[PDB]
Each structure stands twice: as structure tokens, then as C-alpha cells.
Amino acid sequence: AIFSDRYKGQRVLGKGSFGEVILCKDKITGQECAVKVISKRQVKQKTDKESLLREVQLLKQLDHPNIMKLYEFFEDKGYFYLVGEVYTGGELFDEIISRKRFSEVDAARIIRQVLSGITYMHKNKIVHRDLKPENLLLESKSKDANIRIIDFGLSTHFEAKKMKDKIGTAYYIAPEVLHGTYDEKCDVWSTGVILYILLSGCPPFNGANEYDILKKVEKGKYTFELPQWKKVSESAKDLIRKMLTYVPSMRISARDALDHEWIQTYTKPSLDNAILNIRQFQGTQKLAQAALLYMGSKLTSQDETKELTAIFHKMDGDGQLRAELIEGYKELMVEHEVDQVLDAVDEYSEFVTVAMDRKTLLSRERLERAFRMFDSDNSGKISSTELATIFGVSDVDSETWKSVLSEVDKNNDGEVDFDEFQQMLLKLCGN
Numbered sequence: 001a002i003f004s005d006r007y008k009g010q011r012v013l014g015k016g017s018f019g020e021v022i023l024c025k026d027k028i029t030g031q032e033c034a035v036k037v038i039s040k041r042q043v044k045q046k047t048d049k050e051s052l053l054r055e056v057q058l059l060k061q062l063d064h065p066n067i068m069k070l071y072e073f074f075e076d077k078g079y080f081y082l083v084g085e086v087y088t089g090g091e092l093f094d095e096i097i098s099r100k101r102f103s104e105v106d107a108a109r110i111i112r113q114v115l116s117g118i119t120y121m122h123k124n125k126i127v128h129r130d131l132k133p134e135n136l137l138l139e140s141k142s143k144d145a146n147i148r149i150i151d152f153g154l155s156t157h158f159e160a161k162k163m164k165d166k167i168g169t170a171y172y173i174a175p176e177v178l179h180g181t182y183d184e185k186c187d188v189w190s191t192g193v194i195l196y197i198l199l200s201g202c203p204p205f206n207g208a209n210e211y212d213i214l215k216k217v218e219k220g221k222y223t224f225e226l227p228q229w230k231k232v233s234e235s236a237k238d239l240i241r242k243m244l245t246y247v248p249s250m251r252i253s254a255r256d257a258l259d260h261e262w263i264q265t266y267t268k269p270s271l272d273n274a275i276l277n278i279r280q281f282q283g284t285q286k287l288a289q290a291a292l293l294y295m296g297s298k299l300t301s302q303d304e305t306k307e308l309t310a311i312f313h314k315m316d317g318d319g320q321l322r323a324e325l326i327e328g329y330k331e332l333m334v335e336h337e338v339d340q341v342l343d344a345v346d347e348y349s350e351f352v353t354v355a356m357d358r359k360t361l362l363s364r365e366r367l368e369r370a371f372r373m374f375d376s377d378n379s380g381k382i383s384s385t386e387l388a389t390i391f392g393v394s395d396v397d398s399e400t401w402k403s404v405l406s407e408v409d410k411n412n413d414g415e416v417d418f419d420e421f422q423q424m425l426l427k428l429c430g431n
């Protein structure tokens with residue numbers, strides 16, 4: 001069975017763990033599907049091919065309202081295709097940051113759905129291991145919408161260190177996953193971390209960079225000693241303690257977390273400080289991601305323009321080429337789709353300059369949206385202290401970004417506007 005013989009790509013949906021996610025359409029029935037394309041050369045398999053096929057077959061037969069539905073699985077010489085259901089409500093935290101009010105009832109309603117999904121998958125001997133906010137999608141971008149857990153079962157078969165992929169993962173990993181011996185209790189720990197963030201807006205294990213967060217997770221010590229925890233019930237704190245128990249055999253099960261008094265009481269007072277902190281948290285994570293994407297896209301577009309100029313030169317020394325511009329794009333890469341991308345751009349040098357400038361403007365606009373969102377007081381600038389947090393999350397060395405900051409503007413007074421921030425990212429990816 002061949003994937004392209006059944007589905008056609010419509011548009012990109014986002015970046016997933018182990019691969020890119022494309023919105024596809026069945027060529028006969030018109031059914032829309034989310035397809036994750038895992039490149040075999042950039043991921044690698046940690047199990048035998050027979051074990052993967054067995055897990056996929058089991059996953060296709062499972063059904064729970066809080067677990068993503070997997071429909072199909074294809075494989076060719078260079079890729080794996082995971083075909084499943086489209087959830088259009090966005091990421092859970094992106095919905096929570098838009099709310100004006102959030103309470104323990106809102107938090108418990110969320111955590112009951114995650115724990116229901118997890119309890120079901122653990123009965124079927126499936127472990128997630130990489131449970132995190134990004135893997136919690138909503139069916140609708142609204143309150144009380146159903147939460148679907150994505151990627152439950154892939155970690156056991158695919159190998160995860162590309163920085164843009166690792167960002168936002170160290171907060172949630174169970175300490176025993178770091179040391180190598182782990183079972184289904186690691187999913188309770190990650191849910192405990194998510195619950196701690198929902199009620200305080202701050203991760204229980206934090207640090208200036210990836211390794212500093214992992215050190216805190218490995219020691220496993222945390223506290224409820226922040227002013228915002230004074231406005232939270234002891235029952236919520238008691239559940240978090242059972243969920244963040246260090247020794248996995250002593251940690252509460254997902255089933256026993258659903259039967260905890262906190263879940264049963266609060267799923268039958270606004271946490272204003274928690275909403276303020278979670279916005280700052282999401283903004284920081286999203287600006288670090290956007291910054292790494294921008295740098296990655298600048299190297300990709302620099303490499304592609306060098307490869308594209310060689311293909312278009314060899315095909316000519318007149319210096320001019322409609323039909324040959326189409327053939328050259330397909331050499332680097334639907335004939336109707338390719339024709340339309342070149343018609344939008346409309347001498348091959350001027351065409352290459354217009355097609356590149358169009359990609360550069362769109363790359364600048366995605367980064368700018370994330371910068372604007374991070375700048376919640378609309379000051380137009382981000383401080384040196386905020387740059388340290390952003391570059392810490394994105395794993396850019398301190399002496400390196402401070403040197404680059406000095407080279408962009410010698411008279412920065414510990415702040416950068418958007419244009420200066422963008423200039424610094426260009427210097428950090430060899431431009």
C-alpha cells in the first residue's frame with residue numbers, strides 16, 4: 001500500500017515529535033487527516049520492525065475520547081507515515097493563556113481528562129513517556145473542550161537532540177526515564193508536573209538551561225513555597241505530592257489519581273497569579289521555539305538558494321528562462337501546485353531574488369508575532385534578563401549571545417527591540 005496513492009497534502013499543521021505534521025485529504029472519500037511524516041534517516045528505530053508493526057496494530061484498535069485516533073500507517077524506503085484524526089482546537093496552554101479567569105475546577109477538569117486517557121492506555125500496556133503540554137490538543141479552541149493526548153506509544157519505537165525538538169521537554173520527564181529504568185508510572189509524574197504548572201503557572205523543576213532543569217528533576221526536590229500556592233487547596237497539593245513521588249513503586253497510579261478526593265470534589269476563586277505566570281511561561285517557550293525555527297529556516301533557505309542557482313544555471317549563458325523555472329523547482333523538490341507557486345513570484349536571478357525575499361519576509365513575520373506576544377506590556381523591547389531566559393531555553397551560550405549583542409548594537413542599555421533581536425539571531429546562524 002502506497003500513501004500518495006490514497007492521500008494528497010493540503011497544508012502544514014505544525015511540527016511534531018519525530019517529524020513534520022501535514023493536513024492531508026483522502027483522494028476518494030474527502031476525509032481530512034493529520035499525517036506525521038517520520039524521516040528514517042533523521043530519527044532511527046530503537047526496536048525491531050516486527051515490534052513496531054505489533055504496537056501500531058494494537059494502537060489502531062484502541063479507542064478513548066481523550067486519546068488521539070490512529071487510522072493508518074504506511075512506510076516507503078525513506079519515510080514512515082502516521083495517519084490520524086485532525087484536532088483543530090490548538091494546544092491546551094495556548095487556549096488557557098487567552099482566558100481572563102482560571103480556577104482549581106478548570107485545572108481539575110483538565111487533569112481528569114488527561115488521567116482518563118492515561119488510565120485507559122496503561123490498562124492496554126502502552127506507556128507515553130513524553131507527556132507534555134504540546135502533546136495535549138483540543139477538539140475546539142474553547143473552555144470545557146475535549147483534550148486529546150497525542151503520540152501515546154511512539155517513544156518505545158523511535159529515538160528522540162536537535163535543540164528545536166528538545167525545547168520544552170526537560171520540565172516533564174520522570175527522573176527514572178533519565179536513568180533508564182521506567183514503566184507506566186513515568187506518565188503519572190509528567191501529569192503531576194502539568195498539574196503543578198496549571199495551579200501556579202511555574203514549573204516545579206526549573207533552571208537557566210536544559211541541564212539545570214534536568215539536575216533539579218534528577219534530585220526530585222520541589223516546594224509549594226511561592227505566594228500563589230497560598231490560594232490553592234491542600235487536597236490539590238496532596239495529589240501533586242502523590243504524583244511527584246520519587247520512587248515509582250511508591251508513586252500513585254493513574255487510576256488511583258482519578259479516584260483522589262481532589263478530582264472527585266472539583267469535577268462535579270480565580271488563580272490570577274497562575275494565569276499571569278503561565279502566559280509568561282508559554283510566551284517564553286514559544287519565543288525560544290520561534291527563534292530556533294527562524295535560524296533553522298535561514299540556513300535551509302541559504303542552502304536551497306545555493307542549490308537552486310546551480311540547477312537553473314546548468315539548464316541555461318543567456319541569463320533568462322516559465323517552463324524551465326518549473327522543471328528546476330521540481331528537481332530541487334503536484335505539477336498544478338508547483339506552477340501556482342512560480343506564478344505568484346512571476347531573468348532567473350531576479351526570480352530567485354523575489355522568491356527568496358518572499359520566504360525571508362514570511363520567516364520574519366512568524367518570529368515577530370512570537371516577539372510581540374512575549375512583549376505583554378507592549379514596551380517594544382526585551383531586557384537582558386529576559387534575553388538570558390530566552391537563550392537559556394533555546395540553548396545559546398551566554399558569552400556567545402552577549403558578544404553578538406555587542407556587535408549588533410554597542411550602545412544597547414541592556415535591551416533590544418525586535419529588529420535588534422532578529423539581527424542577533426542572524427549572527428548566531430552565520431549571517
Ligand SMILES: Nc1nc(-c2ccc(F)c(Cl)c2)c(-c2ccc3ncccc3n2)s1
Binds near residue numbers: 084
Ligand atoms: N507531535 C504531534 N504529533 C501529531 C500526530 C499526527 C498524526 C499522527 F498519526 C500522530 Cl501518531 C501524531 C500531531 C498532530 C495531530 C493532530 C493534529 N491536528 C491538527 C493540528 C495539528 C495536529 N498535530 S502533533
